[PDB]
Amino acid sequence: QDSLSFGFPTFPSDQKNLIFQGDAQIKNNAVQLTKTDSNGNPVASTVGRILFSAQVHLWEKSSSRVANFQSQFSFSLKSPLSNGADGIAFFIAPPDTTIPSGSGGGLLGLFAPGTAQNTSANQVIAVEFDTFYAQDSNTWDPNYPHIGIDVNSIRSVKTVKWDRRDGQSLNVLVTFNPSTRNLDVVATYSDGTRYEVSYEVDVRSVLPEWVRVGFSAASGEQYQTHTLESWSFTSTLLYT
Template sequence: MFLSSLKIMFALPIFFFFFFTPSLSSNNIILFGDAFLSASSIILTRENNCSYQPPLQTTALSSVGRAFFEKPVRFLDPSINATAFSCSFSFTITKTNSCPFGDGFAFLVTSNASSFSLTDGYMGLPPGIQASSDQDSYFAVEFDTSFDRNLEDINDNHIGIDVNNVKSLASIDVVSKGLDLKNGKEMTAWIEYRDSEKMISVWVGYSGEVRPLSPVLVAQIDLSKQFKEFMHIGFTASNGKGSSIHIVNKWRFKTVLGLPPSTKPQQGIV
C-alpha cells in the first residue's frame, strides 16, 4: 500500500533504525470504517448529519475511521527490552456545518489494529484493558475536541497521553499554550519517546518545518513494559454526536532499538 522511502540501517550489533516517510497517496495503508485516502492525505472521518442519531444498537463502524501502516513495526528487542521512537505528522480538524465538533483523533501504537470502540468520545480507542499476560496494549496521543466529564477531560480543546485506557494519564489545555485544535489551520505534531529516560514528549506548532523549542506535554512512562515486540502504528478518529473532518498528512516515523543511554537524542523528524 504505501512507502515513498524505507530505510533499515544497521549501525552496530546492539541497535538498529527503522525509518519511513509514507507517501499518503499510495497503498501501504490499511483503512477501517470511514477512513479513506485523498491526494496526499489520510481522511479519517466524513461529515455527519448530527440531526440524526441512530439507536445505540444500530451504531455502525462508519462512526469511526482508522488508518494503519500495513505491517507491524518492531518496537522491542527481547534481548535488551528497550526502544526509542519519534514521529511527526501534520493535521487539520475542520467543521463545515452547524453540528458541534466531533470527538477528535489520536496517533496510536497498538498490538491489535482491529480492536476499537464505537463509544462517543473515545476516538475509536478501546476504553481500557484488564491485566493479563496476553492482553492487547496500546499507547495514544489524543487531540481531543469534545469534553466528556466521565473521561475526566479537562476541556474540549486538549492533548492527552493514553496508555491502555482512554482516560488520559496526562493532558494539557492547548489554548493555554497559544494553540487551538478547532481553528481549521494545519498544525504539526512531533512525538518522541526514549527508553533511557522513560519519557514521552509532545510538541505541537503551526509551522511544519521547525519544531518548537519546548514540548507542550511531557509524561514519565515506561513503554517497554507496555509494548509487545511488534506493534501497529497509525491514526484513529470518531465523530460521536458531532461532525468534524480529521485529516492527517506528511507522516514520518522512526524507531531505534537498543539505543545506548549515553547516545544523544536524535533530532525530531520534520
C-alpha cells in the same frame, strides 16, 4: 529489522503499505480518517484508522534493547458546528489491532465501552487531540479541549490545555527516548503557538515486542473531518 523509517510528505491515492480500517480513506492527497459526504462535509457516527503495514520492533527481550522512535505528522480539523467532535489520535498497539465494537464517539476508535478505563484490559499508548469534552458523556475528560497521553485507558494519564483551530494544520512531533523513558509531545500551529507535554513510561510493560503504529479518529453525534496531511516515522533499537 532493528531500524525502520518511512515518510509520507503527502498521501497519493495509490497506497500499498497502509492498512485501512473503518471509514478511513484517501481523498485529495490526504487521509480522511472519518467519513465525509459527496461535498466533503463531515457526518456523524463514523470511525476510521490507518496503520503502517510493516511491524515495528519496539523492544527486544533477549537483547535488552528498547527503541528510540520519532513520529512527525500534521493534521487539520474542520466543522461547521461550534463543537466539532471527537478527535484524532496517533497510537501504538499490538499488530493485530482492530476497531473495537462501540469504540466510536469519545472513545476515539481505540477503546471498547466496557473496558475503556480498565488499564489491565488494554494494550495501547496513544497521543490524543481531543476536541469534545461534554462532562455528561465524556466524563473522563477535563472540561476543555486538550492534548492527552493515553496509556491503556481513555482517561489520560496527563493532559494539557489545547486550542482547536478550524481548518488550520497542527504540526506534531512525538518522541520516545529509551534512556529516560520519556514520551515527549510538541505541537505547533503556523503562527508559532506551541503546546508541550511529557510522560515517563516503560513501554516494555505496556506493549508487546512488535507493534504497529497508526492513527485513529471518530465522530459520535457531533462531527468534524480529521485530515492527516503528512507523516514520517523512524525507529531504531538501542541498548539501555
